[PDB]
Amino acid sequence: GSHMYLRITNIVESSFFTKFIIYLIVLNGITMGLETSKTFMQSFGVYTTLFNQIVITIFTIEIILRIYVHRISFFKDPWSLFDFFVVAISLVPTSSGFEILRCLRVLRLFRLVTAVPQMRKIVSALISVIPGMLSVIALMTLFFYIFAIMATCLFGERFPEWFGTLGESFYTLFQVMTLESWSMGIVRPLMEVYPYAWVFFIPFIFVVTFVMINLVVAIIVDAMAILNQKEEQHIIDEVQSH
Amino acid sequence: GSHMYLRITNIVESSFFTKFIIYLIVLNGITMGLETSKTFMQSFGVYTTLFNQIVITIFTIEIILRIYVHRISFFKDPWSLFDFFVVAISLVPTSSGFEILRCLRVLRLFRLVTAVPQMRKIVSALISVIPGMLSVIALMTLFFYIFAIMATCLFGERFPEWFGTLGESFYTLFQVMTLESWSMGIVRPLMEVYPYAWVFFIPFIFVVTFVMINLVVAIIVDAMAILNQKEEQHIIDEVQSH
Amino acid sequence: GSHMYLRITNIVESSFFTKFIIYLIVLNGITMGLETSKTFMQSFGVYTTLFNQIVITIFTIEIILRIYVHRISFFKDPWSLFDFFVVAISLVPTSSGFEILRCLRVLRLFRLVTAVPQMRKIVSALISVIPGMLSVIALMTLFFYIFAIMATCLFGERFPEWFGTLGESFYTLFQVMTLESWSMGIVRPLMEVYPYAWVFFIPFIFVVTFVMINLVVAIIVDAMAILNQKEEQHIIDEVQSH
Amino acid sequence: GSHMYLRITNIVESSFFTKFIIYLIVLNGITMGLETSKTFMQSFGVYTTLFNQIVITIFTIEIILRIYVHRISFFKDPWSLFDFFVVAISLVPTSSGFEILRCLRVLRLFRLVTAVPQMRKIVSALISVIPGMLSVIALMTLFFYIFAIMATCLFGERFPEWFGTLGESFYTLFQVMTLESWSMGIVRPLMEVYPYAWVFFIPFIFVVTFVMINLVVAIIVDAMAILNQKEEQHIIDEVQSH
Numbered sequence: 020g021s022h023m024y025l026r027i028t029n030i031v032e033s034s035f036f037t038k039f040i041i042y043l044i045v046l047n048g049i050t051m052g053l054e055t056s057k058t059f060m061q062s063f064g065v066y067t068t069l070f071n072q073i074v075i076t077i078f079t080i081e082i083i084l085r086i087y088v089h090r091i092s093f094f095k096d097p098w099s100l101f102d103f104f105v106v107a108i109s110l111v112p113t114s115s116g117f118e119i120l121r122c123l124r125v126l127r128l129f130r131l132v133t134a135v136p137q138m139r140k141i142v143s144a145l146i147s148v149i150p151g152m153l154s155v156i157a158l159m160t161l162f163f164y165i166f167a168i169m170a171t172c173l174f175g176e177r178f179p180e181w182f183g184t185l186g187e188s189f190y191t192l193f194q195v196m197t198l199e200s201w202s203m204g205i206v207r208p209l210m211e212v213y214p215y216a217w218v219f220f221i222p223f224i225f226v227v228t229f230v231m232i233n234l235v236v237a238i239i240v241d242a243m244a245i246l247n248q249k250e251e252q253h254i255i256d257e258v259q260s261h
Numbered sequence: 262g263s264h265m266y267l268r269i270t271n272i273v274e275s276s277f278f279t280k281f282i283i284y285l286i287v288l289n290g291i292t293m294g295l296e297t298s299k300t301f302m303q304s305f306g307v308y309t310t311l312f313n314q315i316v317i318t319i320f321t322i323e324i325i326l327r328i329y330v331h332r333i334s335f336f337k338d339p340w341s342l343f344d345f346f347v348v349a350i351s352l353v354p355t356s357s358g359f360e361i362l363r364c365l366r367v368l369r370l371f372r373l374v375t376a377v378p379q380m381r382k383i384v385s386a387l388i389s390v391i392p393g394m395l396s397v398i399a400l401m402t403l404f405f406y407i408f409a410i411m412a413t414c415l416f417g418e419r420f421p422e423w424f425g426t427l428g429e430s431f432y433t434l435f436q437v438m439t440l441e442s443w444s445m446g447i448v449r450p451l452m453e454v455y456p457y458a459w460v461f462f463i464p465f466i467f468v469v470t471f472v473m474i475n476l477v478v479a480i481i482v483d484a485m486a487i488l489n490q491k492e493e494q495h496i497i498d499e500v501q502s503h
Numbered sequence: 504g505s506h507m508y509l510r511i512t513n514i515v516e517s518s519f520f521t522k523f524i525i526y527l528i529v530l531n532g533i534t535m536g537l538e539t540s541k542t543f544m545q546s547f548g549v550y551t552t553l554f555n556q557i558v559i560t561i562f563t564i565e566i567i568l569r570i571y572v573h574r575i576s577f578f579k580d581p582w583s584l585f586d587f588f589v590v591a592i593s594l595v596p597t598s599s600g601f602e603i604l605r606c607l608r609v610l611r612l613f614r615l616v617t618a619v620p621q622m623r624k625i626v627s628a629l630i631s632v633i634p635g636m637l638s639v640i641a642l643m644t645l646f647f648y649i650f651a652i653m654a655t656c657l658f659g660e661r662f663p664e665w666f667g668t669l670g671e672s673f674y675t676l677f678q679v680m681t682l683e684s685w686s687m688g689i690v691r692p693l694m695e696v697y698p699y700a701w702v703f704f705i706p707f708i709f710v711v712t713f714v715m716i717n718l719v720v721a722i723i724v725d726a727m728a729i730l731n732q733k734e735e736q737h738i739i740d741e742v743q744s745h
Numbered sequence: 746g747s748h749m750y751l752r753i754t755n756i757v758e759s760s761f762f763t764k765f766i767i768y769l770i771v772l773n774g775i776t777m778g779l780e781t782s783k784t785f786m787q788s789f790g791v792y793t794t795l796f797n798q799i800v801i802t803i804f805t806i807e808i809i810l811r812i813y814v815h816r817i818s819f820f821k822d823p824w825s826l827f828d829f830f831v832v833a834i835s836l837v838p839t840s841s842g843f844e845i846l847r848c849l850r851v852l853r854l855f856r857l858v859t860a861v862p863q864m865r866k867i868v869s870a871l872i873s874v875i876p877g878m879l880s881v882i883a884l885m886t887l888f889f890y891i892f893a894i895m896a897t898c899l900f901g902e903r904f905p906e907w908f909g910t911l912g913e914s915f916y917t918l919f920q921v922m923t924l925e926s927w928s929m930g931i932v933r934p935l936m937e938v939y940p941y942a943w944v945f946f947i948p949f950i951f952v953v954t955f956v957m958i959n960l961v962v963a964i965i966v967d968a969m970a971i972l973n974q975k976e977e978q979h980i981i982d983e984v985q986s987h
């Protein structure tokens with residue numbers, strides 16, 4: 020039994036195997052770039068379509084193998100779960116009146132992140148910030164929800180494209196947060212009917228802007244506070260212990 | 262006497278009471294989201310209106326109770342003052358030719374910030390920066406006031422929508438500070454009549470931008486200077502005292 | 504002789520004198536805000552005009568006095584030089600076919616910065632950064648000059664409003680640096696004639712953006728490097744000297 | 746032999762030589778600014794054209810000399826390589842149906858950066874950050890490539906100006922990253938046909954924005970972590986060694 024199992028485990032945990040997979044990702048990447056062109060597709064079109072159907076069958080083996088080799092531990096791995104879903108997507112057939120999935124196929128190129136350790140590290144690094152930010156995101160989202168409800172009620176009847184709905188207002192308030200056209204595009208028009216509308220949007224811009232800056236400052240200053248704690252230990256320990 | 266008073270104080274300072282209040286906030290939140298839809302309002306409309314009239318009577322008890330339990334100390338509490346005003350708003354009746362207040366009702370969902378300690382902390386944290394910034398805000402506001410007066414006098418007669426008034430110019434100068442359409446929307450048009458107008462707006466953009474960046478840098482560098490002072494004490498004390 | 508001189512020096516260096524001056528600044532401030540309105544000017548117009556002619560004569564005494572009291576040292580003072588020029592401006596009479604100066608009158612409200620120590624400190628603080636930035640500004644300005652010359656030569660004949668002139672191109676390149684309408688407003692139009700124009704503007708946006716961010720980072724990291732040097736001294740001196 | 750070689754090496758490594766070169770750069774700079782004007786070119790036009798043909802012959806000597814003096818070491822020098830190419834450009838004759846190069850002539854003013862040590866230092870300083878950023882740029886570029894392919898496939902048939910091509914989509918996605926017109930100009934139009942398009946662009950804006958901020962924070966916090974390591978050594982060494 021454990022004779023057969025290790026036969027595959029030595030294959031899977033192989034460096035070659037990894038490298039081979041990575042080789043395909045890059046190739047199926049270059050492939051999917053060229054499929055973008057209907058010129059290319061009119062000549063070398065069909066070659067590409069089978070290469071796609073190959074790579075995807077190969078990748079399905081890969082995952083089955085990875086699962087057999089890792090069993091439970093695989094579904095406990097964020098990176099493997101990703102690889103499952105991003106290949107699973109590529110399995111569900113175009114046929115069934117949902118041409119959208121034919122467009123998501125290309126998420127399988129994210130496997131290159133999943134398969135290359137220095138990419139993995141970066142992603143892990145970026146993500147590591149988020150869980151501290153969760154409450155602040157929640158507060159900001161509540162803030163949006165309140166203001167979105169208020170604007171729907173104040174401006175939605177005269178300005179329904181922008182505020183007719185909680186979603187329209189959620190969308191407009193995000194545009195205002197990015198400051199895209201907020202004045203020329205949105206508020207200057209609102210004021211033609213609601214002259215005091217600036218009393219809603221300037222303070223919204225102040226709060227939302229102030230928060231994002233403070234978040235950044237908090238992150239930097241709080242992180243530098245830890246590095247200073249860590250110094251105190253090692254500087255004070257070599258003063259005490261010596 | 263102090264028999265009856267403590268009967269309520271044990272209720273109010275109850276965890277259950279807090280949790281119950283919080284439960285309503287979330288529900289009256291979800292409620293006010295659905296009121297946004299006239300579809301929903303045409304079916305389940307009236308259920309919602311009474312739930313609103315209940316929650317608001319309940320919340321008025323809550324505050325009366327909170328006041329009896331806390332007396333003076335309550336009106337010395339920013340968080341309670343908020344809760345008073347944000348519920349008071351919700352009391353003043355729609356009737357009296359001011360439909361605006363019907364739209365402010367929803368500020369009562371900010372109680373969720375007021376009622377949940379980790380939200381409270383964040384808000385306290387964000388606000389803690391402001392009092393150091395006060396003079397700089399004052400300087401910036403003076404700067405706006407001077408430039409707003411100057412632009413009203415230079416451009417207001419040909420460009421009254423944007424500069425006819427001190428307020429129009431205050432509003433335009435804030436749009437320029439955010440850089441929304443400043444060139445295409447405002448300055449490029451001004452130059453068609455006042456070719457040297459760029460001499461007003463580029464330097465305004467330099468000053469205002471430079472200041473906001475410097476403020477951020479000052480905050481970070483000045484905060485890291487304190488954390489280094491605090492280290493000196495503990496590092497130097499364990500060198501001296503030992 | 505030095506009997507008479509000190510008679511005035513005790514007046515000038517008076518706290519009252521300072522406070523009186525500051526009192527006028529605020530009042531002549533509020534005044535110049537109300538002059539903004541032709542409604543107000545049609546009623547209380549003339550009161551205002553004489554108050555202006557008073558304040559300005561008073562301020563001219565002030566400066567003469569300040570000069571007599573300080574002699575050479577006055578013209579060596581940036582803050583006094585400012586006060587000289589910002590009041591001098593207000594002296595040159597509207598008459599002489601230059602209505603622009605009537606609009607600069609209001610720069611005299613900057614005296615409030617000049618006259619209030621906590622404002623003075625802020626301004627001094629903001630300015631303290633600039634001299635380190637001088638070379639980098641020079642580099643950036645050279646960069647603009649080169650790119651402005653290149654764009655005038657590439658795009659100015661088809662796009663003269665935006666690039667016909669070194670100044671037009673200098674102005675457009677600053678708009679691109681702020682990212683105002685850079686694509687929709689400028690580059691997307693250029694591409695209709697010069698399809699590879701993106702090869703000029705994306706890299707311009709990368710360089711200019713990268714530099715401004717790096718400048719900020721350099722300032723923060725370099726400033727935190729000094730505060731760490733200063734610690735080393737005091738931490739190492741109390742280790743050696745004790 | 747080494748008699749003749751040193752005759753030139755003393756010339757080239759001369760301070761005067763450097764200063765002379767720098768003098769021309771500034772002059773040929775001022776020159777190329779004035780060539781921008783067809784007024785000036787109609788009067789003093791030809792003077793300028795020969796001055797240009799002189800400066801460029803002189804600069805070609807300079808480089809030949811620099812090469813003879815430095816041999817191999819020259820082509821190992823980024824700054825000299827630059828000087829070679831930026832002067833080489835200026836050699837290839839306008840004639841050959843490529844009027845574009847007549848516009849690149851002016852890159853030779855970048856020699857002033859190359860020739861002035863404090864400029865050199867800045868450029869070296871800015872560049873010093875990039876190699877750490879390489880992987881993150883690669884990740885971001887992969888991200889753009891995936892999203893550009895997806896948008897070409899989702900929106901390119903109805904919105905070909907913006908998404909018809911991988912390049913059009915690459916270009917649009919960069920405009921969205923800068924947030925120029927992203928909503929009013931791009932997404933609001935897309936939604937008229939593809940109402941859920943916001944599900945593509947908001948998350949694209951979140952990822953891309955989050956990353957750029959994190960990069961800046963990482964740089965600052967990671968750099969301050971090194972300066973704290975360096976302190977530990979010198980603070981702990983003067984505790985141990987003394």
Ligand SMILES: CCCCCCCCCCCCCC(=O)OC[C@H](COP(=O)(O)OCC[N+](C)(C)C)OC(=O)CCCCCCCCCCCCC
Binds near residue numbers: 160161187291294373
């Ligand atoms: C800290 C947590 C904060 C979380 C906040 C995130 C919530 C985001 C919800 C986004 C709303 C999604 C729906 C949307 O945008 O569309 C508006 C709809 C449509 O109105 P309706 O007129 O029904 O349109 C249907 C089409 N018709 C008329 C032709 C049949 O109108 C509606 O159906 C309104 C939907 C309201 C549902 C509210 C759910 C969120 C509960 C969060 C509670 C916060 C606690 C205080």
Ligand SMILES: CCCCCCCCCCCCCC(=O)OC[C@H](COP(=O)(O)OCC[N+](C)(C)C)OC(=O)CCCCCCCCCCCCC
Binds near residue numbers: 426532
């Ligand atoms: C460090 C502190 C700095 C603080 C600065 C903040 C001041 C912000 C004031 C905002 C101005 C609010 C009024 C506004 O924007 O509207 C412009 C008005 C209206 O002109 P008007 O033609 O009267 O319009 C009335 C309508 N009508 C003609 C049909 C009867 O025209 C006016 O009435 C002008 C109002 C001028 C009042 C000035 C009050 C601020 C005093 C601050 C003193 C600073 C010390 C140097």
Ligand SMILES: CCCCCCCCCCCCCC(=O)OC[C@H](COP(=O)(O)OCC[N+](C)(C)C)OC(=O)CCCCCCCCCCCCC
Binds near residue numbers: 854
């Ligand atoms: C590190 C230092 C960098 C400093 C760079 C800052 C220089 C900024 C200069 C701004 C240019 C100001 C003039 C401007 O923008 O207008 C363009 C003019 C007008 O052309 P034109 O056709 O003569 O128009 C006159 C009107 N007309 C035809 C009806 C008689 O066309 C011209 O006259 C062009 C003016 C060129 C003068 C150049 C002066 C700057 C020398 C900096 C040297 C850098 C060293 C490499």
Ligand SMILES: CCCCCCCCCCCCCC(=O)OC[C@H](COP(=O)(O)OCC[N+](C)(C)C)OC(=O)CCCCCCCCCCCCC
Binds near residue numbers: 131
């Ligand atoms: C971490 C590394 C990431 C690096 C990503 C950077 C790649 C950027 C490539 C930019 C694409 C340049 C071409 C472009 O934008 O134009 C689109 C073309 C033109 O379509 P087409 O219809 O042939 O137009 C020709 C004109 N016609 C029809 C009249 C004869 O359509 C095409 O030809 C599409 C070109 C696809 C080539 C893909 C090359 C990049 C391979 C990167 C592999 C990533 C590994 C996962």
